[PDB]
Amino acid sequence: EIETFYKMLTQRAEIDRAFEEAAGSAETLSVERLVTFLQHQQREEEAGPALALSLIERYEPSETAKAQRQMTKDGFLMYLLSADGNAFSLAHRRVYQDMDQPLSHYLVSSSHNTYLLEDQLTGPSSTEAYIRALCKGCRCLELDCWDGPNQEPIIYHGYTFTSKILFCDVLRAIRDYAFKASPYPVILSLENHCSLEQQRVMARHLRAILGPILLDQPLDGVTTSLPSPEQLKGKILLKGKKLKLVPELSDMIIYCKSVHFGGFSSPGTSGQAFYEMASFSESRALRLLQESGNGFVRHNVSCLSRIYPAGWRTDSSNYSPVEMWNGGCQIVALNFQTPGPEMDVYLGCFQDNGGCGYVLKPAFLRDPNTTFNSRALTQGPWWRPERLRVRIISGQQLPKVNKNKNSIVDPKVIVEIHGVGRDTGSRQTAVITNNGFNPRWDMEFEFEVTVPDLALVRFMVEDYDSSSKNDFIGQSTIPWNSLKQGYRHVHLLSKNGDQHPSATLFVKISIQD
Numbered sequence: 001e002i003e004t005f006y007k008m009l010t011q012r013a014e015i016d017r018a019f020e021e022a023a024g025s026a027e028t029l030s031v032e033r034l035v036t037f038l039q040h041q042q043r044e045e046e047a048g049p050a051l052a053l054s055l056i057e058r059y060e061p062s063e064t065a066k067a068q069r070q071m072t073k074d075g076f077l078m079y080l081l082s083a084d085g086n087a088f089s090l091a092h093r094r095v096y097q098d099m100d101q102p103l104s105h106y107l108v109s110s111s112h113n114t115y116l117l118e119d120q121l122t123g124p125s126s127t128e129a130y131i132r133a134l135c136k137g138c139r140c141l142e143l144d145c146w147d148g149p150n151q152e153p154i155i156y157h158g159y160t161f162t163s164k165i166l167f168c169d170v171l172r173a174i175r176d177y178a179f180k181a182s183p184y185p186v187i188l189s190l191e192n193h194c195s196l197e198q199q200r201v202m203a204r205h206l207r208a209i210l211g212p213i214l215l216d217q218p219l220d221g222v223t224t225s226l227p228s229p230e231q232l233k234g235k236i237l238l239k240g241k242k243l244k245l246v247p248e249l250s251d252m253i254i255y256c257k258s259v260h261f262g263g264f265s266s267p268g269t270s271g272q273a274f275y276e277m278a279s280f281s282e283s284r285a286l287r288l289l290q291e292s293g294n295g296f297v298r299h300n301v302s303c304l305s306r307i308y309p310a311g312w313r314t315d316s317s318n319y320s321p322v323e324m325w326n327g328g329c330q331i332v333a334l335n336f337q338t339p340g341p342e343m344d345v346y347l348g349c350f351q352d353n354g355g356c357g358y359v360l361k362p363a364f365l366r367d368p369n370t371t372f373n374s375r376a377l378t379q380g381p382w383w384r385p386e387r388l389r390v391r392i393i394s395g396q397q398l399p400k401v402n403k404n405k406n407s408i409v410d411p412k413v414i415v416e417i418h419g420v421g422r423d424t425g426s427r428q429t430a431v432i433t434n435n436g437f438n439p440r441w442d443m444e445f446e447f448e449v450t451v452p453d454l455a456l457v458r459f460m461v462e463d464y465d466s467s468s469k470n471d472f473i474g475q476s477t478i479p480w481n482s483l484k485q486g487y488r489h490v491h492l493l494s495k496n497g498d499q500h501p502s503a504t505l506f507v508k509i510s511i512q513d
């Protein structure tokens, strides 16, 4: 029993099976057999002895098998539960993309009314709100500045009862955390309602506090395009109105001149300058995407566009970012403080490219001569249908969503495809009753995805309730090109984006053209 029970608890058939298939009759996987697994099952492109051997050196527990270039079932499991066994590509968990193009070519992690911790009407504001966001990799922040007592500018939500904070205190927090998560440029959106004098104060604080991090002069030779993330590495840049407004501030706006949306031109008239940025509410954006989908896309190739949540979302709720990304919208601002599927998708996207906060758009979204319109799909390089098969096998140590600490979870799994409208889909498994430790579903879903470059696959686990809304247990969102094949574990995250140390899903993924 102290083995029976013990090791029976700690025992997974699906794993046994997998090893068996891999290893066949042997009690061990030889480097050769492992390589075959890595290739045939895991579809690793760098599949080979070098890979195999590192996996064994890295994960094999038996000194004998290790020394002898072999993997036991235990090392097999370790591997599968490791960062290498993660359904989210380990290789993409480091900056690996081209960081030398104009900013407008990247999707940028952006926050809305960053200072807020809760609702838009009366909740608190705090420097913490800025620290958190920056710690989640956010690059684009928002400061709503108003005149404050003692000639000290404050920040809060204009015309509301939201609590207040100091512009200067905010600046220090930003300075301290701007690059804790990424070395790439941070952009500060200043919504300026300050008197001339206090505007002067702001400028003083900016210079004093940010010091040399602040970008206050154009980049040398940057003439026809926005600089690249690499060129602006380690810098903070301001976005706002440029010449009611003191020069001290206006002179600091370099590549992000706040501008009213004109329309989409083409030549050197109308469709704004690269160093100028327009903003669109959630609604206007949709309509524009609705009527002038390709115009927007094309507009977005050389220009940065900021989207922000509809005014009615006083609860700080969030819209779906995907719909904006499909149009090439880069600065899609969300309420970082609000847990939900929207932020789940948001942070899944930005976990890519080493989580640096700048994720390179697909090529077709970087072609000024683009005929793409996610809303009216025609043939083009973006069209590359794939057949995805996901098998939800089992779950391991699913957290109790909390509740009257006595009931046991009755887990079910939902799998969703987010992307161009035609690709969006969702499927769910059955509910296993009373088992969060090791529910087993062994259910498979298949999805057809025509524009994978814009897709994301999301796994969600709920605790089923007949009497009410199901409790969210954990989640994980993976960008299409980071989705690893074969047998893998999906490491579940909490509402708040936190990693759940031992809560996982064991799955088998296969992608075929």
Ligand SMILES: [Ba+2]
Pocket (backbone or CB within 6 Å): 113, 142, 143, 144, 191
């Ligand atoms: Ba604002």
Ligand SMILES: [Ba+2]
Pocket (backbone or CB within 6 Å): 407, 408, 409, 410, 433, 434
């Ligand atoms: Ba129960």
Ligand SMILES: [Ba+2]
Pocket (backbone or CB within 6 Å): 407, 408, 409, 410, 463, 464, 465
């Ligand atoms: Ba329940």
